[PDB]
Design a protein around this ligand. Structure first.
Ligand SMILES: CCCCCCCCCCCCCCCCCC(=O)OC[C@H](COP(=O)([O-])OCC(O)COP(=O)([O-])OC[C@@H](COC(=O)CCCCCCCCCCCCCCCCC)OC(=O)CCCCCCCCCCCCCCCCC)OC(=O)CCCCCCCCCCCCCCCCC
Ligand SMILES: CCCCCCCCCCCCCCCCCC(=O)OC[C@H](COP(=O)([O-])OCC(O)COP(=O)([O-])OC[C@@H](COC(=O)CCCCCCCCCCCCCCCCC)OC(=O)CCCCCCCCCCCCCCCCC)OC(=O)CCCCCCCCCCCCCCCCC
Ligand SMILES: CCCCCCCCCCCCCCCCCC(=O)OC[C@H](COP(=O)([O-])OCC[N+](C)(C)C)OC(=O)CCCCCCCCCCCCCCCCC
Ligand SMILES: CCCCCCCCCCCCCCCCCC(=O)OC[C@H](COP(=O)([O-])OCC[N+](C)(C)C)OC(=O)CCCCCCCCCCCCCCCCC
Ligand SMILES: CCCCCCCC/C=C\CCCCCCCC(=O)O[C@H](COC(=O)CCCCCCC/C=C/CCCCCCCC)COP(=O)(O)OCCN
Lengths: 62, 161, 231, 80, 78, 59, 59, 59, 59, 78, 78, 78, 78
């Protein structure tokens, strides 16, 4: 119902409560998984599967 | 020297209802009919009142939304919860409808439809029609047209019933 | 064929056990109208008009545990099947209808013959009666269909938008370092705004649809209730 | 103030202006946590749950966990 | 390759489309007579001049209808 | 489909007619005659479309 | 699709009927008859569209 | 598509009903009877549209 | 496309609801209930369109 | 492979579509006259200035209909 | 197999569709003048001022119809 | 058997359909100005303020037409 | 016999049909602003609040246009 509870005023206060500490850790995970995906899936050495045209989900579900 | 305001003498103030208030189902309407500063009905409970305004006819029943109506020369009907109808004829004025369950019809002249006569209207209509052709100027023509319209409305009301 | 599976509420069941081992007041109810059917005093009903309160509360709780938490990614609405919702609505609607019919009061159906004696009985009143008796079952069907399809459509839209957001965020963030960074920033702000708007809309619609799912049943009940006046 | 949809509750005043003006404020009696109290930042002086653990440290911890989750297979791949 | 085709039945489709425009005409007539009644109630004294103007509105709106109808018949027989 | 507008147009006439009658119940006869006039005019277009439909149906 | 312009037309008649009744309820018995008359005409138009929908559906 | 007109027509009736009652709340019963009469008459056209759909989908 | 005549019809009801509340605000409850009734009936029609839409989509 | 096709009867279809453009034109003209009657009823002394403006509106609306009609006939003769 | 086809007559269909846009434009213009008559009968002292705005609205509304008409010419002459 | 077909003239149909969206824009503008004339006759003193808002609606209403117009060029020239 | 066909020009038709959805959005915006002008004259003391509500409605309508436009670009490219 969103009635009350501890509300940090800014980022620096998220360490003033264990629940908000876990929340900021989770937010860090959420936002930091994106740069990791950028680096991993846009890497120079990444190569498409040579057999990618052998089979695809499009033919399977069709 | 605190001049008592003339309205203060009249303690029967108007009962206006706040918007947020809970609804009430009303079975009667408090009608207040007035002629030339003389009331014929004092907050009389009635079932409904029919009034002919400028745009058209209006049938006011209890709980009708707040409104202001500019009446025109025409009959006015009042039907009580008992099942009795009383018909007047008005020449003009205003009707105030309140959502609280009140209706104040203040007319310049309100007379019983019975008091009116048919032959008198007919002869007056003929005289006005004759005088319309001999109207001095545009203003006279408009005045005669106003008089003719009133007479026609009276005749129509009489012929209706 | 017998399939063994489990609902997606186990964590929520654990939380309910943990937090409701002790009593707590309830003051906010999604559908409060099931507790106040009569608004004019001195009116009372001999029919069990408050029988629907328990089912209403349980249904609200169950559907809220499912739908509201389904916004969280990868959360599954285990009951999301057209015919399963049909079964639920059939149970409730037909149970109340058979409660009214088992009363063995035929006069209760007099209002089905719409209109007054002044209208042709065979060609006007009777046709309208047929149409209204059809409309009852149509109301049941409409309730279940609306509940199913609102959820399905909202979650389809959310999945599509999230896929687009992931695609652009992952494969076009490098534009921040390029000369066309402004376009990417504009697109990213637009996507964030749309994300917030979609989440708010889904949160409000999930609760509104339950209001309406319970309101249809309460309307069915009210259509056959008669109130006596105390004297 | 607000943090996303979370709004900080505010206590309604109970004293009238006349009574309020007669109140003598003595911050010496106040706890050290709440001195120079500001409604817009009541937890500025609130102690940390863990000494030396900043919010940014936890955010970086989460980022590192995400990086591990995404990159562990790249260094220790396993067969199907 | 060059291919020339002559479909005879297509002229039916075009004719039907031209008939659809009649709906915009027929509805327009109702609008004029929908407001004529109100005007008569508002100012009964002008029951004559208003009626003439309404007929004029019908004429102009009807003329548009015939223009569309001419296309409908031309393609029906050609 | 041309009848869609024609049928709707009739509803407009018989919609305003009720409003006009309430304002001036004394003029029901004159208003009713005009409403019939409008209905006939709209019906004329309806038959024009109906004629085309039948001609293309039995041809 | 012609029925779309018929069903909508009927709703327009009844919509104006409610306003007309809410203005002069004592005339309801008269207005209702006129409202029925309008429905008897718009519905007749729908029959013509229905007739074509049946002739082609069975030919 | 015929349901588009029926759906709109029903909403128009209720739209007039709401304002009609606000004008004269004392008649929230008489007006209501005519409104559901309208819903049934408009829904009747929808049955034909659905019937044609079911008479062509299953054919 | 039938949903187009449904969404508009719903908008018409609520559009009239606000005016009716503005005219007789105390009567909000009865107006609100009748609006829900009208919304329910209109949605029922739209779903019949969906029933056909899903029947054909999976056929 | 390259294939060029020339379908003849299509011009009937395009012409019929342009005819539908007159539906709004016919409706628009009816709307003007409908409002004219009410305006005359409200202000009966202005039976000429209102009439002049109504003619102006019809002329402009007719021009739009004529623009569409030119395409309707032109395609029918192409 | 790969097949490339080039139909000439389709341009008629697209041209006819563009003409339908005029239906709204023609109706929109009628709406402006319809309100103009009501406005004039409600405050005739501003008739000249109201007429100027109505012309402005007509010019803006007409501009949209030209865009559709331009597309018709582009496809009709290509 | 696998058959791939490439019809060259279909972009005309898409362009015409996109142009049809302009009817709603034109009608919307007419409604805006129609209400403007009525509103001005009611509160003449605030005519200037009303005019600015009316233009704002036109700016926010014409923009939608451009998107539909944009799609026409993206398909007409491709 | 089994025949599989792939028409490369059918996405234009789908794109055009989606663009037609903007006709409702444009008209909806026009209705909002038309009422805004009427309301402003009625109660000019609340111009700011009415203006804010009109913007809110405009934003909601624009979002629907984006939904419709979203299906247009997807089909146009995909
Ligand atoms: C052949 C292979 C094996 C399978 C055989 C199957 C035979 C089938 C026959 C034919 C049946 C045809 C029809 C089938 C229709 C199915 C429909 C269906 O599934 O719909 C979905 C639907 C999903 O429901 P749901 O929403 O998920 O909620 C149900 C849940 O149970 C949760 O709901 P709830 O929480 O409301 O439930 C109440 C709950 C209230 O909450 C609790 O009580 C909490 C605990 C919950 C337990 C239940 C959840 C199970 C979670 C997953 C499994 C847990 C781990 C198992 C580990 C297995 C390792 C191999 O209380 C209980 O559950 C009471 C039981 C508590 C047991 C405690 C035992 C303690 C032992 C301690 C021993 C200590 C020893 C010390 C020694 C020391 C010595 C020194 O299923 C049902 O509604 C139930 C279907 C059941 C149908 C009857 C089946 C027949 C009975 C089979 C019994 C087999 C026993 C032998 C197994 C041996 C191991 C292999
Ligand atoms: C108000 C928002 C509240 C949240 C609401 C809920 C959530 C809503 C959703 C949005 C949340 C946004 C994200 C949260 C904010 C994060 C930034 C922040 O505030 O930092 C506080 C914090 C100061 O607050 P504090 O509590 O006083 O901290 C105490 C000290 O910082 C000292 O810290 P300590 O005591 O913990 O000690 C740590 C230790 C250790 O500190 C460090 O480790 C320093 C950081 C080094 C880089 C490590 C990675 C950092 C994370 C990047 C990826 C994050 C992706 C997700 C970002 C999401 C943004 C939307 O310190 C040192 O040793 C100092 C470093 C000395 C070395 C300097 C050279 C570094 C070289 C790095 C090489 C690696 C580069 C990569 C490539 C390598 C290739 C071989 O400032 C920083 O430290 C930031 C530095 C880096 C900035 C860029 C980070 C990514 C972009 C963030 C944009 C945020 C926009 C917010 C707009 C708000 C409008 C109203
Ligand atoms: C009464 C109204 C309640 C409103 C509550 C408002 C909540 C506001 C939340 C703000 C944002 C929180 C972000 C959390 C991030 C967690 C970590 C993470 O990575 O998640 C990303 C996830 C997914 O983000 P993503 O989709 O970007 O993930 C990308 C991952 N890949 C690329 C692999 C696909 O974020 C969410 O989906 C969070 C949505 C939350 C929506 C609100 C849910 C409300 C209903 C549940 C309430 C539960 C209360 C229970 C209480 C006890 C009951 C007994
Ligand atoms: C004689 C004695 C000898 C002893 C020798 C001991 C040697 C020890 C060597 C190092 C061991 C390291 C073990 C840990 C790392 C394991 C990594 C791994 O396998 O990951 C694979 C898995 C992934 O496996 P995966 O490969 O299946 O995942 C990939 C998935 N896809 C493909 C979809 C991307 O990684 C993780 O899941 C990492 C999760 C995070 C790990 C760190 C957790 C820290 C705590 C955070 C929660 C608490 C926060 C509280 C905050 C608030 C407080 C109030
Ligand atoms: C050892 C690391 C050294 C790091 C130095 C980095 C310097 C970079 C300077 C230039 C940056 C812009 C480059 C623009 C072109 C990039 C093109 C691209 O993606 O190429 C990838 C390089 O891209 C990457 O791998 C990096 C992607 C982005 C990395 C993001 C880093 C962390 C960002 C954190 C964001 C957090 C939020 C901050 C917001 C700030 C602004 C509001 C390499 O592969 P290619 O051969 O080009 O093609 C592959 C096809 N098979």
């Amino acid at each position: 119902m969103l009635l009350g509870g501890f509300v940090p005023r800014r980022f620096s206060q998220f360490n003033r409560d264990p629940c908000w500490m876990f929340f900021i850790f989770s937010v860090g995970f959420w936002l930091g998984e994106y740069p990791a995906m950028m680096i991993k899936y846009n890497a120079r050495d990444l190569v498409y599967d040579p057999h990618r045209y052998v089979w695809s989900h499009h033919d399977d579900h069709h | 020297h605190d001049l008592p305001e003339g309205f203060e003498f009249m303690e029967h103030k108007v009962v206006n209802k706040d918007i947020h208030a809970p609804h009430e189902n009303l079975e009667t309407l408090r009608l207040t009919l007035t002629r030339q500063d003389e009331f014929l009905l004092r907050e009389e409970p009635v079932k409904c009142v029919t009034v002919t305004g400028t745009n058209g006819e209006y049938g006011i029943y209890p709980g009708h939304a707040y409104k202001i109506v500019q009446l025109n020369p025409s009959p006015l009907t009042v039907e009580y919860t008992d099942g009795t109808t009383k018909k007047y004829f008005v020449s003009g004025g205003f009707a105030h409808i309140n959502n609280e369950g009140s209706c104040d019809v203040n007319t310049v002249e309100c007379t019983l439809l019975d008091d009116l006569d048919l032959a008198i209207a007919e002869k007056e209509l003929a005289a006005q029609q004759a005088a319309l052709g001999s109207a001095k100027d545009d203003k006279a023509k408009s005045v005669v047209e106003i008089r003719i319209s009133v007479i026609e409305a009276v005749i129509a009301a009489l012929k209706h019933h | 064929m017998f399939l063994f599976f489990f609902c997606d509420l186990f964590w929520l069941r654990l939380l309910l056990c943990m937090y409701y081992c002790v009593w707590s007041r309830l003051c906010f109810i999604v559908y409060f109208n099931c507790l106040m059917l009569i608004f004019d005093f001195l009116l009372f009903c001999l029919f069990d008009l408050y029988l629907f309160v328990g089912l209403c509360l349980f249904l609200l709780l169950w559907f809220m545990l499912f739908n509201l938490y389904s916004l969280i990614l990868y959360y599954c609405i285990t009951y999301l099947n057209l015919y399963l919702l049909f079964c639920i609505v059939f149970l409730l609607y037909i149970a109340f209808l058979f409660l009214f019919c088992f009363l063995c009061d035929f006069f209760l159906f007099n209002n089905l013959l719409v209109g007054d004696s002044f209208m042709d009985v065979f060609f006007i009143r009777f046709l309208l009666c047929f149409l209204e008796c059809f409309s009852l079952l149509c109301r049941c069907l409409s309730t279940f269909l609306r509940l199913f399809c609102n959820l399905l459509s909202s979650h389809f839209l959310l999945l599509m938008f999230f896929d687009f957001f992931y695609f652009i965020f992952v494969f076009f963030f490098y534009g921040v370092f390029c000369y066309w960074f402004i376009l990417f920033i504009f697109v990213f702000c637009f996507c964030l705004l749309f994300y917030v708007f979609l989440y708010l809309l889904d949160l409000f619609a999930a609760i509104l649809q339950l209001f309406i799912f319970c309101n249809m049943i309460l309307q069915l009940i009210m259509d056959f209730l008669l109130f006596l006046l105390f004297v | 103030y607000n943090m996303l949809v979370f709004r900080d509750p505010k206590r309604r005043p109970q004293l009238s202006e006349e009574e309020r003006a007669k109140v003598v404020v003595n911050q010496a009696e106040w706890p050290e946590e709440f001195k120079d109290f500001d409604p817009d930042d009541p937890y500025k002086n609130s102690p940390e749950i863990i000494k030396g653990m900043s919010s940014w440290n936890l955010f970086l911890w989460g980022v590192e966990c995400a990086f591990i989750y995404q990159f562990y297979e790249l260094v220790f791949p396993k067969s199907i | 390759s060059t291919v020339a085709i002559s479909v005879q039945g297509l002229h039916y489709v075009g004719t039907g489309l031209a008939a659809i425009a009649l709906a915009g005409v027929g509805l327009g007539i109702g609008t004029i007579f929908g407001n004529l009644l109100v005007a008569c109630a508002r100012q009964p004294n002008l029951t004559k001049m208003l009626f003439n103007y309404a007929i004029l509105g019908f004429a102009l709106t009807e003329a548009i209808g015939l223009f569309a109808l001419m296309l409908a018949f031309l393609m029906l027989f050609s």
